[PDB]
Design a protein around this ligand. Sequence first.
Ligand SMILES: CCCCCCCCCCCCO[C@@H]1O[C@H](CO)[C@@H](O[C@H]2O[C@H](CO)[C@@H](O)[C@H](O)[C@H]2O)[C@H](O)[C@H]1O
Ligand SMILES: CCCCCCCCCCCCO[C@@H]1O[C@H](CO)[C@@H](O[C@H]2O[C@H](CO)[C@@H](O)[C@H](O)[C@H]2O)[C@H](O)[C@H]1O
Ligand SMILES: CCCCCCCCCCCCO[C@@H]1O[C@H](CO)[C@@H](O[C@H]2O[C@H](CO)[C@@H](O)[C@H](O)[C@H]2O)[C@H](O)[C@H]1O
Ligand SMILES: CCCCCCCCCCCCO[C@@H]1O[C@H](CO)[C@@H](O[C@H]2O[C@H](CO)[C@@H](O)[C@H](O)[C@H]2O)[C@H](O)[C@H]1O
Ligand SMILES: CCCCCCCCCCCCO[C@@H]1O[C@H](CO)[C@@H](O[C@H]2O[C@H](CO)[C@@H](O)[C@H](O)[C@H]2O)[C@H](O)[C@H]1O
Ligand SMILES: *C(=O)CCCCCCCCCCCCC
Lengths: 108, 60, 84, 42, 67, 121, 103, 459, 182, 171, 170, 12, 155
Amino acid sequence: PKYEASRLSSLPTTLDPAEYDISSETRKAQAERLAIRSRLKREYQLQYYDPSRRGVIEDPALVRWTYARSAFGIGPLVFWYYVFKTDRDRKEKLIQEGKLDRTFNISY
Amino acid sequence: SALLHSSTMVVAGIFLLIRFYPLTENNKYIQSITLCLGAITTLFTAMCALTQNDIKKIIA
Amino acid sequence: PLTLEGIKDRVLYVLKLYDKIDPEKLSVNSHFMKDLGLDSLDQVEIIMAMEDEFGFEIPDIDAEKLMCPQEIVDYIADKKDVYE
Amino acid sequence: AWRYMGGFANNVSFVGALLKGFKWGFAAFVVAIGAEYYLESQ
Amino acid sequence: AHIEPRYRQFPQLTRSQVIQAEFFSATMWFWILWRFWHDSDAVLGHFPYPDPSQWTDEELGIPPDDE
Amino acid sequence: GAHLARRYLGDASVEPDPLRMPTFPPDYGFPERKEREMVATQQEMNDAQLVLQQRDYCAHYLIRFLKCKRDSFPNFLACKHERHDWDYCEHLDYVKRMKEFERERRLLQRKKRREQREADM
Amino acid sequence: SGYTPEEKLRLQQLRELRRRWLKDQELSPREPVLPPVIYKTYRHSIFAFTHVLIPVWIIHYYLKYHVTTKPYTIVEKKPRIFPGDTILETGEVIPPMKEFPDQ
Amino acid sequence: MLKYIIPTIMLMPLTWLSKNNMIWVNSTAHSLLISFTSLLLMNQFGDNSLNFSLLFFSDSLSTPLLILTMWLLPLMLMASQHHLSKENLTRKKLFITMLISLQLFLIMTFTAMELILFYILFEATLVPTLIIITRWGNQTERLNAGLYFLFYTLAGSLPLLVALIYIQNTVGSLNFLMLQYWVQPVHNSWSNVFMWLACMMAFMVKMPLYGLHLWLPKAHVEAPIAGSMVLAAVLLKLGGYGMLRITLILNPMTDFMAYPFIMLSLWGMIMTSSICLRQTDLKSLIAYSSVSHMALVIVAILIQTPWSYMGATALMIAHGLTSSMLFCLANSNYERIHSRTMILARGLQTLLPLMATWWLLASLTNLALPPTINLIGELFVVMSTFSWSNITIILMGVNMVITALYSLYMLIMTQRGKYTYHINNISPSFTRENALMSLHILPLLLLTLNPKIILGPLY
Amino acid sequence: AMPFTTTALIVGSLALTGMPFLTGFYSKDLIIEAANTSYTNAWALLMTLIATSFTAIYSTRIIFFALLGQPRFPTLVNINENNPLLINSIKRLLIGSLFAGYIISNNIPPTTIPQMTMPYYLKTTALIVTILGFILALEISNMTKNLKYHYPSNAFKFSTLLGYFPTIMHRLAPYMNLSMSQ
Amino acid sequence: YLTHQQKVLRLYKRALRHLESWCIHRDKYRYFACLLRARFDEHKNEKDMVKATQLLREAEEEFWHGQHPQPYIFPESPGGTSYERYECYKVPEWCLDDWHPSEKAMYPDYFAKREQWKKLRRESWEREVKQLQEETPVGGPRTEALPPARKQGDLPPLWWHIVTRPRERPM
Amino acid sequence: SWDKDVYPEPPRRTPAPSPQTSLPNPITYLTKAFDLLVDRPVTLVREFIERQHAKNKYYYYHREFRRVPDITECQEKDVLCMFEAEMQWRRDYKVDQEIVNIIQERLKACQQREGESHRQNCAKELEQFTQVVKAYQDRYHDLGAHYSARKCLAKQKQRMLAERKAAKEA
Amino acid sequence: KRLFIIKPSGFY
Amino acid sequence: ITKDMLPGPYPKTPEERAAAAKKYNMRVEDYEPYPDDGTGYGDYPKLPDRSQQERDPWYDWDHPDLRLNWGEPMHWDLDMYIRNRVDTSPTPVNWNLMCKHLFGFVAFMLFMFWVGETYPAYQPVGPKQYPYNNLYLERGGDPNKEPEPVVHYEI
Ligand SMILES: CCCCCCCCCCCCO[C@@H]1O[C@H](CO)[C@@H](O[C@H]2O[C@H](CO)[C@@H](O)[C@H](O)[C@H]2O)[C@H](O)[C@H]1O
Ligand SMILES: CCCCCCCCCCCCO[C@@H]1O[C@H](CO)[C@@H](O[C@H]2O[C@H](CO)[C@@H](O)[C@H](O)[C@H]2O)[C@H](O)[C@H]1O
Ligand SMILES: CCCCCCCCCCCCO[C@@H]1O[C@H](CO)[C@@H](O[C@H]2O[C@H](CO)[C@@H](O)[C@H](O)[C@H]2O)[C@H](O)[C@H]1O
Ligand SMILES: CCCCCCCCCCCCO[C@@H]1O[C@H](CO)[C@@H](O[C@H]2O[C@H](CO)[C@@H](O)[C@H](O)[C@H]2O)[C@H](O)[C@H]1O
Ligand SMILES: CCCCCCCCCCCCO[C@@H]1O[C@H](CO)[C@@H](O[C@H]2O[C@H](CO)[C@@H](O)[C@H](O)[C@H]2O)[C@H](O)[C@H]1O
Ligand SMILES: *C(=O)CCCCCCCCCCCCC
């Protein structure tokens, strides 16, 4: 029985058919990815290991993230309006008729 | 875990219902609900315990 | 409390209970491939016994590099903060 | 091999584990009902 | 410490731990035997359960059928 | 058990309904049937502060046991005979409820037989 | 798959530093340089005095002269009365029960 | 009220005539003395309010808000003096003057008998508040925050002025004591529908009502610490105080006019609580938390029950201390790492053990742990809205769960986990900061012993 | 290797599984008897009884895999229970697990009328199902020692992964809530 | 990124660990471990690399079907019961800079030795930065590997945070 | 210390000790220890304090509010009369709240005092509680947070009109 | 042997 | 940080895609924006919807608790994918099968409880009998009214 991936449960890497057919193009892309990672690692490390540095190492990726993120509207109000309005009309009708029990109700 | 599971938190839920037995003893509908809730609970969790390998989880 | 000699004693002790290794040829510097004639399957099983001996996991990326008893002693000493 | 040798060679069974202490618990019990049967006869 | 670790061997035991364990294991079994001797009905049944089929129609007040 | 198999997996017309018993007059088949006699008075059960569910036809044995239990403190192993008398009265009380069930069951069977006699006639 | 000669040399150089660093975390003999059954019962006796007797004195004084002086602050369940008891306040005797049928 | 107005005014010459290096000592010390005397306002009677003069009065609603106002001024001074240390002396004195002038307008606003006087003072608070944000905020978009804050307010406040002047013409007076006796019922008509909206929308914007709330997170992200403190603790409650007063003359029209605002509030409190679970700016998270809490206050005021009004009063006081404390806690991290990003500096309990305790206590009050006055106020509202309609318990209960989730999420994210490796400037907490946190939480928790002084006139 | 810990664990397990006259027996068997003779939901009664059987199985599982057989722990033996704080604290609870149920049951006033008349098969149900649970558990535990390899069944995975309730609910519910803001 | 040889060896180790979770008993595990090894030794000399990749892919399909749903995890491995347990006690060494002078006075020997390390760090840094400039091609590093020191008295570049990291059991 | 008519309690009936055992009662010896070690020193401190109190006897008084005309007698918009009537109505409202609180305290004390016999023996308290709550509900319920003597009167007149109509249809 | 425990300053 | 380093509008031409990939430290082959709607993602990259729990725990992350490296682009929903929140890791049992087995188990139990209510267990006895008209006065009945007698008989 094959694995069926879901949004909340990914395909395992050992079962992914593209993990076993790795061509020159795929290897070249992985090297380009490792090179980008290594360049950022060095840039981070020259500051992180700098004995004279005291502070925070500002991360442009973090700043871009918070900037990007800091940058179903009447239907529930109408829905809730009819739920509470219908309930309170029913309740008000019974009190006027005396059919609602409020024997010990003196806090409101 | 020893104190959470024995003399403090988890029995509080049971204790609350015991405090209110003057009301629950006159309510068959409430009795049916708590009965079935406990029954499914006692069986389901005991069934989970049969295969657990972590000693603390078996006791939990 | 582990010591550098204590770790080394137990690493060789485990290897001296492995039938594919002759305990007379074994030293701390014996390469598992070049001196003892083992294969990489064998090397994986040696690392697994070390993990069992000391009760912690050696990730595959590090484990593949450990090719003699001394490199295992160094690796265990470094992760356990053993300086003596 | 060390796991099957020395002080680990023989371990009790499940029944033997449950019966740990039975011998002296029974000996003490026999003495107690014997004592209680004697006094009750007085 | 007062107990020193051992390698691939059964551990060192004190005489206090062994005796105390045996005492309380034996206490548990004495208690069970003592209680069972005196309160076996707590396990087996406190009273006889009647067989309703053995009751007569006279005592249940069942009149004869042709009546 | 067994009585449940007869009702749910058999003929329920001749099986008592536990929520509607009894369904025959108490004196049907019992000429001169005595009443159950209550020993403890209402005031005695009130003063003893018995739980309402304990204020039944065995309450006098309970009142005796509770008084013994208080008087024997700290000896919490005494009053064992008083407790058995209360437990025994409850047992007999339970047997009486079993007989009421068995009487009801047989009267429902007699009625069923008396209906095939007429269905034949 | 073993180490390369440069990987081994870097690891060796780091190892020497790490062990020297770890050795230097050991304290010296003078560190820290700090600024300038009777015992059983006495320790237990002082504990009972401060943590039981003094608190109970305070609580009793508080319950007796402030709490119980207000209506319905400490409400008791009234004592159970059994057939045959004698009331202390009045001297009343509670009649026995009716005689039991044999059982 | 002159015994509070005049000494507050005298804080201005005190600050300007102080020795250069004594401006924070003198202003802080003397503002604390004014705060002490504010407790004389507790002479409240069971029947009558404390009516000083033809201009000012103090009942059990205004008194707790007055005490909170005058308590907050020294705290804002303490909180501000560090990030203003490099400012030149004249601009420091001008900053302190804005805070003093804000106190002056606020205590007059809360004690005015006549509603036009309340309106002018209610409007006057805008000026120093706007100046504090646009002049002493750090970032470029403080200018936009000022315009949003300014024009949201005036979009609602100008209709209120027209309604207030209209009411005086019809009734003959706007003295609040007179309105209590000459109030007449509001009958159904389109004219009265717009009178109702004109009487209420200005206060809705201040609270802020859900759907008119987007100015608030914008304002907080731009304001300096003192700006956030006064905004969160007092300025929002001007709208709450205004609604509690003006609803007197809006019956029985409030019966059906409240519905759309109750729906916005009841649903809005769930929406804003959920939004807090995904906020990445710590100040913006606290700002959205205020919106959710103030939604309860709006519901309490609109359903108009004795229990709801008591809960509204307690919630307003309790939120003011709690939210002000959270901005102060958030600001203490900011003064070290110079970022409001919540995920930047983690595991701070390892580095700042006692500040972790303050974070814990602020979070516990934010999620309304019994018996904090935070829970007392929330519980009373939950009690009263259940009678209004039993189904509301579902939305109230769900909001409690989400509030606990984001309150503790804040605590776990910043204080727990591992510390960020490269942040190596987390210096030990200063005495000033520890005192500032304790000067919020201690009075807040002491109010548990005597809640009646914060439950308002319906007590 | 750990005698006192072993004694307390055996006592605790037998107390848990309703061993006659230990502390647990004085409540569980009254509860099972009261349930057996009550006007009750029949399905709930059966579930409770099967669960009583299952208690025996997982208790045997702890005892069997922790105390019996051969050591499966690492080679450096640091087993040591000879600490008075450890022995004494467990000792006081071990005494509680023997007599507390008996002492408490003989001192508390009666507030109900306990059911004491019932058929023998309702009287002994908890004991019988408990004994069958132990017997069943011992056959399964010893089958792990055979040189046979077993594939996982669906019931095994359902049990091991907790009916999948945590996997589904703890991924889906947070995802739906944490996403609906956007 | 992983070679074929690395994937097979990773699978063997992963398969053996799950097999142990199933077998539990050491004698039973030894028996089945040897059978498992014989399955790998069967195809050890497969020179057709398309066939070898098919063998591994089916092997990983087999592993996914037969894996233990609750495998044993070493306590301090990721996902284990002691993983990260001691992180709360790890305190970075820069925190000592902020100690009050009276606190530092309690450990005069320790803090004098700490100053020597800080001096060693300061005097080494420029040579480390220079060594990395000389050895890094124009495009920048293509990998994350760092070099050893090449002279006497040099320290391996970027050593401080490795050498002075918190102890695994710091308190 | 308080009025026994306002907060009544029935006479107390304590049975005498009646031991049916030769074992000593631990509670009796703890009681004697409590008297000697706790009560007597506590009583000695209190008697010293009361001796200081007797040297300085001074009094406080319960404030008496004259009755003033009700809102029914106030001309419309006459705030001087309305003010006094409104203040009087507010004082009465607080008093009626405490009257209900007294009756609820009676009920709760009876429930605890009567034990397992409360359902029968607390009927008189239950009835008095039922009536005062009904009267209190009629006066003050549903007025809203902006309550007043005016709104209270409007409710009474609405109730009076409903009672007049119902009597007419009969 | 006794090892120095690195912790944040507690003096303040 | 300059404006050119901050998130921008959705990339229109292929030369804006290359600039956007470079700004976010990505290969232009890998870079891919969110679909151009009014949703408001701009040019922020759309990265795989995976939990941080799925990352290699042994790699030397700059942020080990988050498993992020300094400078790498962060998933738009990173705050949802931290290790304390939503996990997307592969499961030993397929997602759909798990849902069936859990739903099937709960549904079967709820049905059986319904059956157990309709055919309850009980014992073969009649009602429990109480004296004094089923304890009329004790249960709170009106003393002034006279209850309709309940009479119990011996059997
Ligand atoms: C209220 C009273 C309750 C009943 C009280 C009964 C008294 C209990 C007395 C227990 C004392 C027994 O003392 C203990 O007995 C066991 C008998 O196997 C001894 O054990 C002995 O045999 C076992 C092997 O089977 C091994 O441990 C070893 O060969 C030897 O020690 C312990 O070494 C001894 O310490
Ligand atoms: C006739 C109608 C007008 C009535 C005017 C009544 C007030 C007259 C005040 C005259 C004195 C002014 O005093 C003059 O200004 C300020 C404050 O006073 C002083 O200088 C000030 O410098 C700084 C503030 O910047 C502070 O240290 C301190 O406030 C003070 O020393 C001058 O050294 C003094 O020469
Ligand atoms: C967020 C904003 C929320 C806004 C909520 C809006 C609520 C809308 C309320 C609608 C009711 C308005 O008020 C309504 O006005 C009309 C005016 O013609 C009144 O009715 C009056 O005019 C109509 C003419 O059509 C006549 O038939 C009627 O005899 C007369 O009395 C109603 O008596 C009143 O009920
Ligand atoms: C309420 C608490 C009640 C506690 C009740 C305790 C119940 C204990 C039930 C034990 C039933 C007997 O269990 C029996 O043990 C013997 C031990 O030789 C075993 O019998 C056989 O099986 C195993 C495995 O093949 C062998 O190790 C054993 O030598 C052999 O005789 C079985 O495992 C089982 O048939
Ligand atoms: C005393 C215990 C009392 C409670 C006992 C409860 C047991 C009730 C179990 C009900 C759940 C059964 O759930 C059912 O299982 C089978 C077997 O996988 C599934 O069947 C499906 O999956 C299997 C395996 O992939 C395949 O045959 C195929 O995909 C499909 O048939 C059904 O889709 C599901 O509906
Ligand atoms: C006789 O006294 C009945 C006692 C009950 C025995 C338990 C039977 C459980 C059967 C399962 C019920 C299925 C749902 C209707």
